[PDB]
Symmetry: C3
Subunit: 243 residues, 3 copies
Amino acid sequence: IPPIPPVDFAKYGEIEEVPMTRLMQIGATNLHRSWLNVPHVTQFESADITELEAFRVAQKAVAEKAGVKLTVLPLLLKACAYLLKELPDFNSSLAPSGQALIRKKYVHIGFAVDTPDGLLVPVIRNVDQKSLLQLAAEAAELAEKARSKKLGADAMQGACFTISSLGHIGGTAFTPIVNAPEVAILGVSKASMQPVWDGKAFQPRLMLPLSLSYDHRVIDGAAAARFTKRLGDLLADIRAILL
Amino acid sequence: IPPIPPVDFAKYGEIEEVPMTRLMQIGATNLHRSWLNVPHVTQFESADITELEAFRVAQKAVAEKAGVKLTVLPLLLKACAYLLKELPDFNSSLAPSGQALIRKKYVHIGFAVDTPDGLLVPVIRNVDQKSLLQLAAEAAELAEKARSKKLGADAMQGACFTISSLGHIGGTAFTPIVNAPEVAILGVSKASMQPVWDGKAFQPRLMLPLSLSYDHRVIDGAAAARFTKRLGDLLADIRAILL
Amino acid sequence: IPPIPPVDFAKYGEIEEVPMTRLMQIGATNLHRSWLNVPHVTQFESADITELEAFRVAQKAVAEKAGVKLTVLPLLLKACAYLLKELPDFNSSLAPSGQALIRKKYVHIGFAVDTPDGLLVPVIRNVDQKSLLQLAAEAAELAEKARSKKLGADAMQGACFTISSLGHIGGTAFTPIVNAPEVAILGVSKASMQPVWDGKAFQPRLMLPLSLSYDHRVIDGAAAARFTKRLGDLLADIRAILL
């Protein structure tokens, strides 16, 4: 690939060199590998979480008695494990022969944690089998160990899908990069009150923006649109997961 | 390009291998070729189709008497053939010498059909010369032959531009990949009722999201913004095509 | 990288060859270099410029007496120079060793001008030190020289960040390409009146869409979300720059 020409940055002013942690460097390398290997498409959708939010906030009592904080992330994780079982092409990887997909029969999901040293994506195993408070507990633990560098490499392996939530900082949407060999990643941004037409007038609903980037070699456009739609449907009523 | 490291997926659970159809494999190869060759930008816009929709629905009678179904796709095709003649840099391809553009004086447009076996993009020739019911007829035929594998390779060649419509499944927008050697592709997503300021209050208008990805080597930002704007203008009043 | 197969375009109709200016060719080459080198993510945000706009329009008198036109661009430039000093990772470049960042202690910003011959990105030096009317003056001058080919190569060097404004043509958002060796670019699109929930009802506010694409090797998701958020905050009240 052509290299970027070097520039004497100091011709233009004072410069200072700060170095990259080995974590940054690793991260850099892996992102570039994915970028060049995966033809990326991002599919955007908005989900109506007005009722999810109300539920979340009402279980604050129960969550506190169990020692967890109930955030949107366990809810996101549960709904995506369910969908990853329904739409198995999203829970698979392109086999090295380029002619086969390896469908995984297990659902382990990573979530992005931004730490001082760089990005870590701890993995929760068998998300499909854990309850909302189990997942809330575990997510937090893995997050604290990640910030504290106490996260052992084991816990960073064998994920099937990644959720990257920036909803806590802000933004309308973004286009995340697929962590190959996985085939998709869900970016989640800040929720806003939006007017949503009820057939007769505009009702304020709390809308969560979802950005699903996918490996277009493995997932086609219609499959991805169907995935964010189902997910919008599941978050609008999490009871459908009970069915 | 660095390869993705192989992972023993079975360390983490039960895996199953399903194979890729030759169609998937072809598709995979071509998408990756475009991805690495084309510096991609997507330009997003929303078009007011309230009046297009009303027209569409009112001609249901005439369409039924002719045996066609009038969808938004013939309307999309007609308006883009008109624009492809107005803004010819979008109807061209980068010549192999990298120093010339080949402007095509003909307008043939492909549209994406997702079939069981993979993606096919049948091509309608001389879109600029056909009427809305001719195009509605032909689109359907090519679509049925595509699903039925009866589409002969001939009908998959020499397109100038591609429309990818996911409006029927859902979604807010996406970033499609350019089918090189073409220089642009129009993604269309689901139409929603949106509040649109009329200068004094917000009026509900039916808005169609458009996502135009383009080859930034050939098309610059202003040209693309001008293309989706004109298209938003043409769909808001299809009578401008008569002018 | 696999080449695109040549197609005899004339099998399908009449073609005509027009050539590329040396400017287009240069541009093409550089964009492809960035594209293959930079793993790109775009972060989208909307900023409330209702009060910025009112200010802009009220200073029309003063601007006219000084001979400048006060557009949103000097306002954009001032606010980004301030942020580029606050969040220095955005004002830096990946050192050729891949293991260091070169933080620039100066703020020079380029802005995209689309000319007949291709794209030029004139650079304003030390944006952080100039006033809104100085910047309005200079932006215009560099723009006129650019259209008139009187822009000397000197003035196209050593920028730290680029703003690409298409707000004057239209569009909702786009995904700009990073001009490597810079690490980020701000795309700005057309401002619209939007309903924004005030806690009790929807208030019409003039919203400006911002699309920040960044080099994900150097900038992580949270840093970028934090940058467009701060920028949304600064444009909602430019007096925070005084602090």
